C-alpha cells in the first residue's frame, strides 16, 4: 500500500516539473472566463481603464477577438501586460477568443444586461491563489505505538538469559508478544503461535540452549509479522507459469466478543476482469471460532481456481465477501506487475483484518505485454456497402452478436473511421494473451478518435490499462472549458482503475494544475465522492494529491469555502427545527457564527468562485416556504463594481440527481448551438457541498406557475408593458419552452406540475425540480404525462386560442432539437453510464440507459422522428388522443402469439389431437376460437388449448418456409352463414391437424408444432 503511495507521490513530484510557478500560463492565480464556440451582430461594452473616473462605452462587434478590443480601448487613454476581466468577478477573458464565445458575454446578450469589463495589467490582478515558490518547492504528502512493546519484549528476553528463574522470565516474554499482537490490529500469524508453543515446550524440557533457539525463532516470527503489517519493502515471466491460481485463506484476526455470540462464518471468493466475474463464485467451508491467544475465525483452506497464472490478465482482481458483513478486493498483480505472493493482511470495516496466504516461490513471477506485430496493413463492394451501415450504428447497444463477429473480422478496413473503435473493442471475441499482440499492434496504429467518443473507452467494459492510457492520450484534445462540464464522469471513471497511479488521475491533475476552475470543480466532486464505502480510501488519496499539488494559496481558499459551507449548513438545519414564527428569529441568532469568520476572511462563493464575499445583508437574506426550508443568502460583493450575490442553499434533499439533470440540459443546449440552434435556455448551476445539502444558483425576476396562478399573459405584460416588447418577450417563451419540451421527453422527467415549471420576467421557461429525472419506464409502461403544455402556455404562443404560424415554427424547433440530440445519443448514453457508479437513484442499471436509447429512437430516420414528436405535441394539448399516442409509442419501442420456442423434449410428445368444439368471442374482434383437445404420451388426462383461425393460418405460413407444400397438408381457403362456416371449419381444421400429425416424423415433431400446442394464458382456464 505505502510502497504504491510512495511511487504515486514520486510521479506527482515529476508531474510538478512541467508546471513551474514562474510560468504564468500554467499558474495564472485567477480563473479564466469559460467559453463555448458558437456558430453565427454588435453590442455596447463599458471598459473601466486606469486614470479615468468614467469607463469608455462603445459598440464592439462580436466577431473581433479580445486582443483587438483591448487595443481599441488603449486609444482613448507593453501589449502582453493588459488583460480584460468581468466587473465584480475575479475571472479574466481569453486573449485569442472572440467576445461572443465567452459564457459571460452570451449570458449578458440573452439576459439583455449592460456588459461591464475592466482593463488592467497582470500586476494589478488579485493572485491570492497563484502557487508560490515554496508550494512548487515543497514535497507531496497526504506517532508510533508499538516501539515501546518491542523494547519491553527485547528487555524481557535480556532478563530471560538468567537461569535463576527461566520459566518466570519466559512468562513475561510471552505476555509481551500478546500485547504486540493486540496492538497490530490483533493479528497472530501462525509463525508466532508455533514459536510461543515451541518456547513453552523448550522451557519445560531442560553451543546453544533450547530456550535461546526457541526465543530467537520468536523474535524472527514477530519481525516477520511486522514486515506483513507495515507491508513495506530469478524472475520468471507470467505467461510461462502453468500452475493453477490458488491461495490459502487462513483466518480473520481481532474478532469482537459480539461475533462468538452468528453461529458459523464462511467466505465467497470471486475472480473478475472488466467488472464481470470470470467463473461462478467459490464458497469456503463454514467454521465457528478458534482460540489460542485471542478469538479468531481459522479456515486454513486452500482455494484453487480453474485457471493457470498464464491465463490471468493484468487487471484481474480477487473479491472475498464475508458472511454481507464486509467485502475486500485484492489485485492479483501489484502496481509493479509482480504477481501477488506470500502472506497478505486485508482490512475490512463493520459497524476486521483477513490473512490470505499466497504461494511464495523462490522466483518472483512478473506479467509482461506481447511485442508489437508492426504489420502496418483490396476494397470489396456490397459487404462494404453493408459494413458502412454497422459503423453508422449509434452505439454498441444497437449491435447483434452476428453484427459484432462480422465487425471484428472486417477490423483493418475500418481504419478510415476512428470513432467506431469502441464498437470494435466491444466486438472483440477473446481477451487471451496471444490475441493481445494483434489488438495492441492495431491500437498503436489506430488513428486518434474524438475525445467525446473516448469517454466510452473509460467504462468498466474497457478496463485494459493500454486501452485506458490511449483513451487518456486522445482526451488531451479538448479545451479545459469543455472538460469542466464533463468532469464528474471522469471522477466516477476513477473507480475503474485498480492501481492508484493511473493515466486518468495523472491527466486530471495535469488539467487541474493548468486551470484553477478544473482544480476547484475536482475538489467538490472528490469531496462528495469520499462518501463511497469501498472507493473512499482511493478518493481520499487523489484529493490529498490534488490539495498538495494545488499549493497553500488555493488549498487555504478551499479550506475557507469548506468552513463557509459547514456554517451555512448548520444555519439551514436550524430552520427545519422551528415551524412557528420563531423560525424567522433563529436566522439572526445562528448568523453570529457565520458573519464572525467573514472578519479578515474574503471567502469566494463555492458555486461561482469568481465572486468574492465580505459579509451578509440580514434584511435581504430570507427563508423559502416549502418542505425542505431552503435559505436565500444575499452576500455583499467585495468588489464595489459587482452587484450583491443572491444564492440558495438546501439541506435534507439529495442534489446529485439535480446536478446530473442540469449537466445533461447544459450539454443539450451546447450541442444545439454547436449546430446553430440557440433556444435561449436558462442554465442555473448547483453544487453538492456534502451529504444531501448544497448551494443552488438563484435566478432573478422569476416565479413558479402556482404564484402566477394566484395573481400568465398578464404576468409577462406587467414586466413587458408594450405589445411590441411583449411579442419579443413571447418569442423567448416559444424557444425556451421548445428546448424544455425536448429535454423533458428525452430525459424522462415526467413529474411536471405548476410547482416545478418556472418562468422568468423576460419570458424564458426553465424546470427546477428533478426528483425523478430518468423515470422512462413509468412513462412508457403505464398510463406521468411525457410533456404538459397548458392552454395558458398555448395562449402565450403568439395568437390566443387560435391556430397560428408560430405554433408550426415551435414544432419545427422541437423536431430540429430532437434530431440534433438523436445524432449524439452515444455521448448522452456514455455520460449516464459513467454516472451509474455514483449510487444515484433511477441510474443503477444498464436497462435505464436502454430506456433513454429507446426514447431517442436512433435507428429511426430524422423525418419519421419529426412525425413522432409532432404527434407527441398534438397529444400534449384530449384523453382519447393521449391513449392512442401511448399505444403507438409502446408498440414502436417494442411465432407471434407465443414468443418463447418449445420442443417436444420439454412438454412431452403428443399421441392424439382433435378440434373438440368452437366458441364465439366478440373481444377484441368478432372472431371464432377453436378448442383443441391434446392427449400427451403417458398422460392419462387430456389438456386443452384455444387457437383462433388466424393463429392456425400463421402456423401453416410459418411451416411453408422450411418444409415444401407437397409434404405439408392443404390449408382451407363467402357462402352459407358465419356460424355454419365456423361449424364446417371445425371439422376441416380437425382434418388438417390429423393429416399434419400423420404425414411424417420430421413434420409432426417440428418445434413450431409443439409451440403451437403449448399452454398459454388464453389456454389456462
Ligand atoms: N431542486 C430545485 C428547486 C428549486 C430551485 C430554484 C432555483 C432557482 C430559483 N430562482 C428564483 C426563485 C424565486 C422564487 C422562488 O420561490 N423559487 C423557488 C421555487 C420553488 C421552490 C423553492 C424552494 F422552496 F425550494 F426554495 C424556491 C426560486 C428558485 C428555485 C432549484 N432546484
Numbering used by the authors: 4 to 43, 49 to 85, 93 to 157, 166 to 229, 255 to 281, 293 to 320, 322 to 383, 405 to 432, ...
What does the paper say about this structure?
Phosphatidylinositol 3-kinase type 2α (PI3KC2α) is an essential member of the structurally unresolved class II PI3K family with crucial functions in lipid signaling, endocytosis, angiogenesis, viral replication, platelet formation and a role in mitosis. Like other members of the PI3K family, PI3KC2α contains a PI3K core that consists of a Ras-binding domain (RBD) and an N-terminal C2 domain, as well as helical and kinase domains (KDs).
To determine the X-ray crystal structure of PI3KC2α, we embarked on an iterative process of construct screening and optimization of various forms of PI3KC2α from different species assisted by hydrogen/deuterium exchange–mass spectrometry (HDX–MS) to identify disordered regions. A purified mouse PI3KC2α construct containing a re-engineered internal loop sequence and lacking the intrinsically disordered N-terminal region and the C-terminal C2 domain (C-C2) was used to obtain the 3.3 Å crystal structure of PI3KC2αΔN+ΔC−C2. The overall structure of PI3KC2αΔN+ΔC−C2 comprises a large compact multidomain kinase core that is mounted onto a helical stalk. A conserved feature of all mammalian class II PI3Ks is a sequence insertion of about 100 amino acids between the RBD and the N-C2 domain that is absent in class I and class III enzymes. This sequence folds into a unique stalk-forming HBD comprising four helices. The compact core region is flanked by the distantly located PX domain that is stabilized by contacts with a neighboring molecule in the crystal. The release of the PX-C2 domain from the catalytic core may thus indicate that the obtained PI3KC2αΔN+ΔC−C2 crystal structure represents an active conformation of the enzyme, a hypothesis tested and corroborated below. Consistently, we observed the PX domain to be displaced from the kinase core, and closed contact I involving the N terminus of kα12 to be disrupted in the crystal structure of PI3KC2αΔN+ΔC−C2. Instead, in this open conformation of PI3KC2α, the kα12 helix interacts via hydrogen bonding of H1391 with the backbone of a short helical segment within the intermediate section of the activation loop. Torin-2 binds to PI3KC2α in a mode similar to mTOR.
